[PDB]
Amino acid sequence: MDLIRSADIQMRELSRLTKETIHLGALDEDSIVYIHKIDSMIGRRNPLYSTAIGKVLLAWRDRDEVKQILEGVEYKRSTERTITSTEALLPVLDQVREQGYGEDNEEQEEGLRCIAVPVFDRFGVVIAGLSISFPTLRFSEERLQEYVAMLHTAARKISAQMGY
């Protein structure tokens, strides 16, 4: 597929620029599926509500489609920070749409942080999320903003190559 071929190039570029773990994820019913990865030094499945990619796959969607997708989900509290109801998640999705990126701030695993941005198809629907990992510590608003800016560049190229 063309999405993975374009993504592969831009993900290798982010890995080059950042040395971080880069993922490409897509919606599989009521979970995310990792479809590509470039490692720090693919088929894995994860919750929609605790992943940065999950948040971006939902945030631009019709909010009735969202509540539909999330109907079947059994929320599980992984960590202190995990969002564990639809009612708690919908306001988070508002912020994701507003700011243009989604995050997982130790919501799946202590010590793990991820930041993600939407990848659009030719119609403006989010078809994948493109993310960057993180060990949590050296937090810099500056690192976050630089990471978001480079994700957006990468995603816009992938989307353009999709016909967006």
Swiss-Prot record:
Q: Which GO terms describe its molecular function?
A: DNA binding; DNA-binding transcription factor activity
User: One of this protein's GO BP terms?
Assistant: negative regulation of DNA-templated transcription
Domain annotation IclR-ED: ranges: 3-164
Mind telling me which GO cellular component terms the entry cites? cytosol
Shown residues within the full chain: 88 to 258 of 263
Query: What gene name does this entry carry?
Result: kdgR
- The residues forming the signal peptide are none
Q: Which keywords fit this entry according to its UniProt record? A: Cytoplasm, DNA-binding, Repressor, Transcription, Transcription regulation
Q: What is the protein's name according to its record? A: HTH-type transcriptional regulator KdgR
Q: Which organism is it from?
A: Escherichia coli (strain K12)
The entry's function note states: Transcriptional repressor that negatively regulates the expression of kdgT, kdgK and kdgA, which encode proteins involved in transport and catabolism of 2-keto-3-deoxygluconate (KDG). Also represses expression of eda, which encodes the Entner-Doudoroff aldolase, by binding to its P2 promoter region.
